[PDB]
Amino acid sequence: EVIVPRSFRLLDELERGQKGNVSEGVSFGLESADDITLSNWSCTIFGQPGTVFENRIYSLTIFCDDNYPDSPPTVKFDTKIEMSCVDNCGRVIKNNLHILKNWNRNYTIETILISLRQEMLSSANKRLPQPNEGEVYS
Amino acid sequence: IPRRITKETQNLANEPPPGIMAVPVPENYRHFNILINGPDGTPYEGGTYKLELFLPEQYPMEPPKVRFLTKIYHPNIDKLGRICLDILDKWSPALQIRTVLLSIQALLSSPEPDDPLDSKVAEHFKQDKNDAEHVARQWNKIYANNN
Amino acid sequence: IPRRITKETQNLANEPPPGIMAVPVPENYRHFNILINGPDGTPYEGGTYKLELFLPEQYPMEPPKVRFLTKIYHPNIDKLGRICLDILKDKWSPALQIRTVLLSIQALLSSPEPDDDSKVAEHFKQDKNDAEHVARQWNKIYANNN
């Protein structure tokens, strides 16, 4: 098997995100334009139409550590969101998200963003009341 | 003007916890200015840290809001000074402003990099504790010199 | 473990082009550490530039992946060390090898291509001498041997 090193793996994901060659409702790029380690990712997921999350954008931050992609990155929302997999500080609970709970190296930052958009559709989160549009954690 | 807020205000001014100072802002009894000394035996030793505390309308039914104004290199405090404390869902009217400030003070002595709020800072504390504390000690020197 | 990759690895180690050094990473035979000397008569003169190169699954039908690790002020190299070069993009051929890629990057340091929107490229367009002055300072900061 061909082992793609961390740096080139992250550069490939960056090329995809920057191009707009991404899934619908998700966007991802680097938090800092000159972050050579490519560790801190500024992300966005769009709220699912027909749910309480609809018509609003959620800014969030994903951090890939030195063992990525062999180990899961950490996820944290900047825009305030009420969900089963998100704690009161915005951090995604690893156990409450299947792709983070059982991480595979083939999963990407995109995969995480899509999986969060899916969790919006679940019966537990679908009708759950949300704070005002554009609120940050405090 | 609730009786509890006035009592807590007086309790903090007359009998403050060691290394902690808390006074309200004139013409806003809900706004608080906090000074916490960096604990001994930590990279923050000798430093003075500014914090702001807001009491919401529903207090003490709802928890207060707190964040650092002074920059600090700590795995459980983000770049904007925000913290992640359970007692701010695990909140109860049984707890007081004094409880929150003591909890923040305790956090400076007990950083938990495995339970991080700033993942970048946290990875540094895990990979190289000495160097992370060194950076934190330098931050203390330049950002927390005197208030 | 292809015969070509081994042959190229040995060729780069035994007959390296002047100012070029390439050696695979012990953990990964397809991942290369690279040094390229800053060419004479450039703002990068005397500088030691680190790069990493990866040979992807479809090599040699597709080009190697390459980036600078040493920060550089150059119209064709961005803030992450990514390189705007034809043979890395569309103009690749299996007849070209790692050697050719490294030589092209080296040549690119001597012959910048400022007509290939970027803030850096615009700076080289408007004031070449001042942009090279900035580049010379970055070379001292980022590309020394100490």
Side-chain angles (χ1 to χ4, degrees), chain A residues 109-125 128-129:
Chain A
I109 290 158
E110 194 177 18
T111 303
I112 301 167
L113 296 174
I114 300 163
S115 70
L116 284 168
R117 291 232 314 151
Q118 280 303 311
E119 292 287 321
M120 290 180 164
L121 296 165
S122 80
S123 57
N125 300 321
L128 217 168

Side-chain angles (χ1 to χ4, degrees), chain A residues 3 7-8 18 33 35, chain C residues 28 52 54 65 67 80 82:
Chain A
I3 307 298
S7 56
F8 290 99
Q18 284 191 328
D35 174 18
Chain C
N28 200 333
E52 55 173 343
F54 175 60
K65 309 273 194 187
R67 86 189 278 214
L80 306 166
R82 293 183 303 186

Side-chain angles (χ1 to χ4, degrees), chain B residues 2 4-9 11-34 36-78 80-116:
Chain B
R4 172 161 171 164
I5 294 167
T6 315
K7 209 279 161 191
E8 285 196 63
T9 304
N11 186 36
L12 291 164
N14 296 343
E15 198 182 311
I20 300 167
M21 285 177 71
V23 285
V25 174
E27 288 196 319
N28 195 358
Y29 64 97
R30 314 200 87 93
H31 200 321
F32 274 84
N33 280 130
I34 297 89
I36 301 175
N37 292 357
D40 291 341
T42 70
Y44 323 106
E45 189 184 323
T48 300
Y49 292 84
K50 278 189 170 292
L51 293 94
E52 60 181 11
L53 189 146
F54 284 91
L55 295 173
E57 291 181 351
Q58 291 295 307
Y59 182 86
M61 305 317 296
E62 287 183 331
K65 274 89 175 294
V66 206
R67 75 171 179 104
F68 284 84
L69 294 164
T70 304
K71 296 173 99 283
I72 184 162
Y73 204 75
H74 197 287
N76 311 118
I77 311 165
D78 71 13
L80 295 162
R82 290 177 298 188
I83 47 164
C84 186
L85 287 180
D86 276 340
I87 63 161
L88 296 174
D89 207 46
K90 285 197 176 186
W91 172 256
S92 173
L95 314 171
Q96 304 178 74
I97 299 159
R98 192 185 171 95
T99 325
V100 184
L101 306 177
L102 281 160
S103 185
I104 297 166
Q105 188 187 53
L107 181 62
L108 306 175
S109 307
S110 298
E112 299 290 343
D114 290 318
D115 193 53

